């Protein structure tokens, strides 16, 4: 049972690391969306 | 931890398709007969122990599974070229592809975790540094991610 | 022209007898050439 | 201490986030910028109460740890309240020459640079969103109503 | 060791649930950024 | 079996895709049994000529690399389509892609070369031929290089 719980906890740690990596990636992609939004907004304002 | 579980279907398919071209005897392993002959057919035939010293990266034998985990652990931390270009564009607000070496240095040598002077020099002696000390990160991300390359 | 016609005639004679005879039987299944033809047609019309 | 545990934690996070030169201790001048980033509006005289380096302090030798930072944040927070938008726009109603509830951009941007503490055109221009286009007479309501969100 | 592993696995489960909640929130916020981008783009075009 | 650098990416892809259809058991070789199955899928019982024409060249089973060099040596003698079109354009009286067949025939029999009238006629039976005899070399280069348009 100790061995089983060790395997399960290591799997959950791996999944947690994957989830944190995904969170960081989603954050940086949201910053990309924000950057594009600002750039396009400024382009439309300058064209106007 | 088990790194293999991290990767995209497209990346796994790319590795599988590549491996299928190398696994010429179809035993599922990396072997002396196949990749050396393949590389000799594709280029200058470096069939010397330089290739054995590369095959010896795996613990003893080198199965497709071991190849996958090796390349997996090597790809751990890497991100899309567009996402990295976005991250650079946070400083290059005009999106010029022309960030200065002084700016790049300031962003790396003290701010956050410190890049060494050796790593900074590497970014000039391999990576696309240009006239007046402008740096073309749009080319950098292409060679870093091996996308469209 | 002498070198070009020598080369083209030499190849033309051989591709009418060699493994091209097998290849040509498989060729119409190679969808890549059809998509390439479509792409080329679109590019040609775009250019026009 | 009047601050909550959550506020103290947030201040400690901010303290180590707005870094670094190299050391983990904040610079004497930069501390004021941290307090201002935390939305406070004290005068530089509040720092002059501590009076680290009586001379010009490019060196910033009077660096702060969190235990030295937090009391300054507290004395700032307990310094004074701030008035409503009417107290602001009364100033504009005095500066104005039209008597219409707006003000000339070129004049007001200059006045806000010359009077009191000094600011750059780079600083001031970023405060306005109703920019001086075909119309010279900017409605100062937009300026105050925007910045007071901070 | 069983008690320790139980505590650790419960903590990792809590962290994983938090990470998944955060992932969902970041996704929905990215969709919000996209929606605002489209709306503001259309507004700038119509104002121009 | 040095080949990968010698031919165009499109040609190599075409050969690879073709080979994939013939390698029915999917292992990177092609055997007598694979050719037999292929010929059975294409038509009647084997005429042997096609299969013997591979087995006489090969030491036994044929590797994809060996297949590539075989087709490579078979394609050796071809040149770039634009370069050939340029060479023909030096002599095209219409200056448009349509050199006259009598002119082309004369050029094959006077300028050092002495190509036989039967072989010249074969180039109008199987390679292109057009109205008034204005041979379409623009189509000829396309089928010579296998660069479709
Ligand atoms: Mg093998
Ligand atoms: Mg096979």
Secondary structure of chain F in HEC code, one letter for each residue: CCCCCCCCHHHHHHHHHHHHHHCCCCCCEECHHHHHHHHHHHCCCCCCHHHHHHHCCCCCCEEHHHHHHHHHHHHECECCHHHHHHHHHCCCCCCCCECCHHHHHHHHHHCCCCCCHHHHHHHHHCCCCCHHHCCEHHHHHHHHHCCCC
Q: Are strands B134-135 and B99-100 parallel, antiparallel or unpaired?
A: antiparallel
Upper half-sphere CA count for residue B35 (Cβ side, 13 Å): 19
B chain contacts of residue F63, beta-carbon cutoff 8 Å? 24
Contacts of residues D94-101 at CB distance under 8 Å and 24 or more positions apart, as own/partner, are D98/D137, D100/D137, D101/D139, D101/D141
CA atoms within a 13 Å half-sphere pointing along the CA-CB vector of F78? 24
Contact A18 B5 (CB under 8 A): yes
Collect all residues with Cβ–Cβ distance below 8 Å to F125 and sequence separation of at least 6. Answer: none
CB F85 within 8 A of CB F136: no
d(CA A1, CA E20): 27
Contact B83 A10 (CB under 8 A): no
Residues of chain F positioned with their CB less than 8 A from the CB of B21: 28, 64
Token pair, residue B30, equals: 């990396």
The answer to whether the CB of F142 falls within 8 A of the CB of F130 is no
Contact E20, A19 (CB under 8 A): yes
Whether residue A10 and residue B1 make contact (CB cut-off 8 A), yes or no, is yes
CA distance B92 to B79: 19
Contact C19, F90 (CB under 8 A): no
Nearest-ligand number for the alpha carbon of F23: 2
For D22, name the nearest residue in chain B, comparing CA atoms only.
B110
Can you name the residues that pair with F62 across neighbouring β-strands?
A: F30
Chain C hits for F126, Cβ within 8 Å: 16
Compute and round to an integer the Cα radius of gyration of chain C.
16
Q: Which of C2, C22, C30 sits opposite F113 (nearest CB)?
A: C2
**How many other CB atoms are found less than 10 A from the CB of residue B41?**
19
**Residue D80 to residue D41: CA distance in whole angstroms:** 9
Length of chain D: 150
Q: B–E contact (≥3 CB pairs within 8 Å)?
A: no
Q: Who's near A6: CB < 8 A, 6+ residues apart? A: E5
Q: Determination method here? A: cryo-EM
- Kindly identify the ligand whose nearest atom is closest to the C-alpha of B36: 1
For the four alpha carbons of D91, D93, D97 and D103, in that order, the dihedral sign comes to: positive
The span from the CA of F68 to the CA of F12, in Å, is: 8
- Contact, F77 vs C14, CB < 8 A? yes
Nearest to B64 by CA among B96, B94, B34: B34
Among chain A residues, CA nearest to E22 = A23
Residue position matching structure tokens 């190679």: C30
Tell me if B86 sits within 8 A of A35, measured CB to CB: yes
CB within 8 Å of B53: residues ≥ 6 apart = none
**Which chains are within 8 Å of E by 3+ CB pairs?**
A
Helices (H), E1-48: 2-47
Q: Please, are residues A12 and E16 in contact by the beta-carbon 8 Å criterion? A: yes
Cα angle, residue A30 at apex, residues A25 and A35 outer, rounded to 5°: 125
CA D87, CA D89: separation in Å to the nearest integer? 6
């Amino acid at each position: 049972q100790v061995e089983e719980m060790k395997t399960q906890l290591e799997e959950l740690e791996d999944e947690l690391q994957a989830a944190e990596d995904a969170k960081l990636r989603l954050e940086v992609n949201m910053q990309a969306m924000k950057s594009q939004f600002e750039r396009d907004l400024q382009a439309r304002d300058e064209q106007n | 931890s088990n790194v293999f579980a991290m990767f995209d279907q497209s990346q796994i398919q790319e590795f599988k398709e590549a491996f299928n071209m190398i696994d010429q005897n179809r035993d599922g392993f990396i072997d002396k007969e196949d990749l050396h002959d393949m590389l000799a057919s594709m280029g200058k035939n470096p069939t010397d122990e330089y290739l054995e010293g590369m095959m010896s990266e795996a613990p003893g034998p080198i199965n497709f599974t071991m190849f996958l985990t090796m390349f997996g652990e090597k790809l751990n931390g890497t991100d899309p070229e567009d996402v990295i270009r976005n991250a650079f564009a946070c400083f290059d607000e005009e999106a010029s592809g022309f960030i200065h070496e002084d700016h790049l240095r300031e962003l790396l040598t003290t701010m956050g975790d410190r890049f060494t002077d050796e790593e900074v020099d590497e970014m000039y002696r391999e990576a696309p540094i240009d006239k007046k000390g402008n740096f073309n990160y749009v080319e950098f991300t292409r060679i870093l991610k091996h996308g469209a390359k | 022209m002498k070198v070009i016609q020598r080369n083209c005639a030499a190849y033309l004679k051989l591709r009418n007898w060699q493994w091209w005879r097998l290849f040509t039987k498989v060729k119409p299944l190679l969808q890549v050439t059809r998509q390439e033809e479509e792409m080329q047609a679109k590019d040609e019309e775009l250019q026009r | 201490c009047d601050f909550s545990e959550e506020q103290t934690a947030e201040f400690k996070e901010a303290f180590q986030l707005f870094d670094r030169t190299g050391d983990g201790k904040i610079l004497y001048s930069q501390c004021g910028d941290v307090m201002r980033a935390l939305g406070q509006n004290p005068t530089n005289a509040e720092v002059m109460k501590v009076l680290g380096n009586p001379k010009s302090d490019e060196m910033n030798l009077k660096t702060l740890n969190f235990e030295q930072f937090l009391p300054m944040m507290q004395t700032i927070a307990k310094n004074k309240d701030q008035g409503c938008f009417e107290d602001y726009v009364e100033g504009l109603r005095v500066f104005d020459k039209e008597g219409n509830g707006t003000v000339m951009g070129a004049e007001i941007r200059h006045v806000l640079v010359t009077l009191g503490e000094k600011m750059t055109e780079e600083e001031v221009e970023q405060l306005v969103a109703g920019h001086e286009d075909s119309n010279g007479c900017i409605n100062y309501e937009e300026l105050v109503r925007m910045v007071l969100s901070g």
